[PDB]
Design a protein around this ligand. Sequence first.
Ligand SMILES: O=C(N[C@H]1CC[C@H](Oc2ccc(C(=O)O)cc2)CC1)N[C@]12C[C@H]3C[C@H](C[C@H](C3)C1)C2
Ligand SMILES: O=C(N[C@H]1CC[C@H](Oc2ccc(C(=O)O)cc2)CC1)N[C@]12C[C@H]3C[C@H](C[C@H](C3)C1)C2
Lengths: 546, 546
Amino acid sequence: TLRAAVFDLDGVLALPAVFGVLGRTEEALALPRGLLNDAFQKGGPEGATTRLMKGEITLSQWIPLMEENCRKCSETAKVCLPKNFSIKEIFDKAISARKINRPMLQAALMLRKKGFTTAILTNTWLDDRAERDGLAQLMCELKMHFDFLIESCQVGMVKPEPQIYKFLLDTLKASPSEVVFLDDIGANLKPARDLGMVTILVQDTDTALKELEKVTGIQLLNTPAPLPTSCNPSDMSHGYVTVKPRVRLHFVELGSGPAVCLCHGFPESWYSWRYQIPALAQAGYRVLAMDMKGYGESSAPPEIEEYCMEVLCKEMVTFLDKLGLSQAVFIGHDWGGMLVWYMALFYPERVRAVASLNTPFIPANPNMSPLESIKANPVFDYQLYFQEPGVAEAELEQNLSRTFKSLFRASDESVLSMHKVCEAGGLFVNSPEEPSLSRMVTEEEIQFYVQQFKKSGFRGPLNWYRNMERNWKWACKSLGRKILIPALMVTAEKDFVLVPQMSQHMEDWIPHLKRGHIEDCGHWTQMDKPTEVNQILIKWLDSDAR
Amino acid sequence: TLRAAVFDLDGVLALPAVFGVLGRTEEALALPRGLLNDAFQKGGPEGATTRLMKGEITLSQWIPLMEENCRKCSETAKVCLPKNFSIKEIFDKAISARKINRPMLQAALMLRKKGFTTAILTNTWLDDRAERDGLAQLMCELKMHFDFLIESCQVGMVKPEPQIYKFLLDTLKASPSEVVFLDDIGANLKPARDLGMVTILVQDTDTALKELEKVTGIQLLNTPAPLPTSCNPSDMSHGYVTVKPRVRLHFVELGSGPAVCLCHGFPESWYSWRYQIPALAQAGYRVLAMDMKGYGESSAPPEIEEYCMEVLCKEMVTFLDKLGLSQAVFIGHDWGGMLVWYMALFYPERVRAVASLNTPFIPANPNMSPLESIKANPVFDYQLYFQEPGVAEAELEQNLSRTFKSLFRASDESVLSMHKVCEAGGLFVNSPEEPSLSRMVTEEEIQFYVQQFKKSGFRGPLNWYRNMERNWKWACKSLGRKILIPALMVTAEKDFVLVPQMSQHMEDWIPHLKRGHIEDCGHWTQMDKPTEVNQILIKWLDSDAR
Ligand SMILES: O=C(N[C@H]1CC[C@H](Oc2ccc(C(=O)O)cc2)CC1)N[C@]12C[C@H]3C[C@H](C[C@H](C3)C1)C2
Ligand SMILES: O=C(N[C@H]1CC[C@H](Oc2ccc(C(=O)O)cc2)CC1)N[C@]12C[C@H]3C[C@H](C[C@H](C3)C1)C2
């Protein structure tokens, strides 16, 4: 009974196989067949390549040794090498052209989700080339999806030596019959097979995967579109910035490149961006997923005014001051979405680009109170219910598990009616005590929000709604301004509070405004439609936030 | 009696004054005198410029309004503007050319160190230009050195209106007679003077500063070279990465750009890089100042083997994996210096560039035990004293204040003899119980190390020395390798343990090796010679680590 799956890198997890460059280069340079491949493997276990793969020498130390071997092979074959022939050039092109074999990684991901222990066993080198980063990046993306990465140059052993296979079994803590071994080289499969492991000679991915699903009894081939990579809270880098003596802000940080500050809505967490964090980091960005003031590990002072937009924005500026960031791209959802438009309005020098999910830019009406403006919309009734301190806190904190399960639902899953909330007496009047689990969330994900909300509760989060007059007065100072920095508005078809039509007049204030739209998407955009959110944000970031 | 100093930005803290572009552009374009200056101030308090400075409109909204004013002024003067005349072009050039007035900032720094409350009061705009970052960066560098920054566009008030001066007094919590007000515009000084404040019309910095020192009774002019900016632990972003279930690594993070990982020595802290952190962040780097395993907020497991170079290096690789960093430039001092050469040897794909302070790259002697090799040098005796678990811990933890005060000393301040330590019985046998404070450190700085060492003590730190045989066996695997990635070796003339001559044969292993050298520098390089360390590292980073 199989419990582990082992994959090679070259020709298995990454395509095209770097070994294949030698065959094509020979064919392009009209060189004799197998000349480059024979000079590469010249000397066998005592040769320059085995020394490289064992970690005795580095790639740059190997280049002149392979050049000698190529000259020796051309001398014997009675042929001449071209005038400007370069092994570094050939290898640089072979490595940079090699990409992740997405369907193989998907199959590995599926086997791990199903309880398998997964590992990458590869014959590789210590790369000290000027362009080593390309390969470094490839390995980083791949490695994080496996339980183990065994590299020949790090263990001082090489395939097909039987020692690396016993090392693999020991690392795995599994007997050979419990292991599937995927490799594109038949000579490297023999020892695993000879040990008793299930082996798959990988030629085309499709057949390899067909052989894989047959031996595992798990569907891997032509299975549905997987959700993007999520975040395990314990594996993240956690950052803490004191913005004021009583106020500290917490954030999760991943990636390198231009700073992308993610601002969640109500009643959420940095974890609301769980499906965007690994994707924006992989796309070339330094993501900073905030716990906004009043939430999770961020401070939650009790006073209402600590949560007005003026104070929240000043503290986000200080957060950048203390981190040594002159700018950041600001991406907000819901209450975070409103915060980001005001960051762009009051601090454009600090905002590289601004993006909002669901929340339109809504300019203050100087001829009307916000309480009047709220009353004009029946869908906004819950905001009046949120006004009296203590009332919504007591109902939302009574059963944390019920609160998040009732709230975090897809458009066809609604168990809550946000209309006539005040007259009913509460948010959960004709709502189930034990709501069903939404298809958007797992029990574990809901429990992370429950755990987060145990520290400060709902006072701080609800205080974001308790500054209408203060926010209105502050917003009126910006009534003659326009948003002229790069800006993205993303609407969600099925958000029944923040309806797409609420964003219709945004171009009057933001003329160069770019847009995105998500159909069959409810209020909880990031977890409802993570794949499309990632696609819209990444495309916009690369074009406008550089 | 003066207690506060207020400085304007344009023409005072930053030169050349942006107002001066209008005069030079007129002169370059052979335009009538004062034409650009008159169109800029056109309409006075009701004009486009006052609206800009009050925050009613943004800079990009202002550009076409200034263009109208310029056309109106040319129409009256009966002159024509050039065919490709652009206010955006003129202003972009004026802003980017404007730099910090270093001697004025130094005087502000000196007044604050002497107990003054300092502030920047400036007439400024909301900058939404594509090139706003240049100005954002300028303000970030400057603002962090003052208690307050009052910007006209944020307070909705402008100089010379008397309201901004009463707002300043209220922000300051000082009466007018306690305030020095520095401004390059006489019209903007009048209200401060009329209120009773000491005022200085700033023309040339030298005279302004001469007037400043006379009224303050504090030497500001031609005073010694100041130490680089240091770090206040409470104002930093603190990062936490779990690398293994029992091991968490702590770091301080500042700046944006290529990742620079700083690795301290024994018995130190991230705080040993206090003078390098703000300088490398200002030079365009994302600094990650580590608390190495066994130190400060990083985990300190008790077992000896948790501190061998193989485990320490693997955990630094994981630290990069979890932060989403494919590479980092690795800069080490002392034990951190040794760790970084081994990072370059075993993980060149993860190391962008490598730099060491004092620690040479020393390749393992396969024909000798490290215990034998240590005994060959009388200056290395303390390492044998460090071997027996508990002995050096008990002596180093007995009096934390004494330990750091005795250790952290300049070359002419030595109170400790590291020779014949074993025979004497300890590290502090003929050492004072109450050592004098070194000129390199303050009492507050020593107390930060005392506080840090109260958590785990010296077991973890001392365990770095207790893996000689293990480190030796591991290092022998790299005996055929060369360091071919960018590398910097920095020697300190007066380091009597890690003598510059110990680095003499490094080019045999690292042929492209670059060097730096610091004279009159002891073991504690970063705090001994911070200015020269910053100059050497910054110059090397910009040339080799890009
Ligand atoms: O109220 C705001 N968020 C709510 C958070 C809770 C959610 O509850 C839901 C959502 C969906 C469902 C479902 O499908 O069953 C049920 C309950 C409703 C939206 N957002 C703002 C954002 C800005 C600033 C201010 C005024 C205006 C513009 C709306 C708050
Ligand atoms: O021992 C190492 N650091 C000491 C830390 C304490 C300091 O104590 C001092 C220093 C100066 C003074 C003074 O001026 O009074 C007094 C005491 C002496 C140096 N560094 C290593 C770094 C690598 C790896 C291993 C072997 C070799 C190479 C030396 C440890």
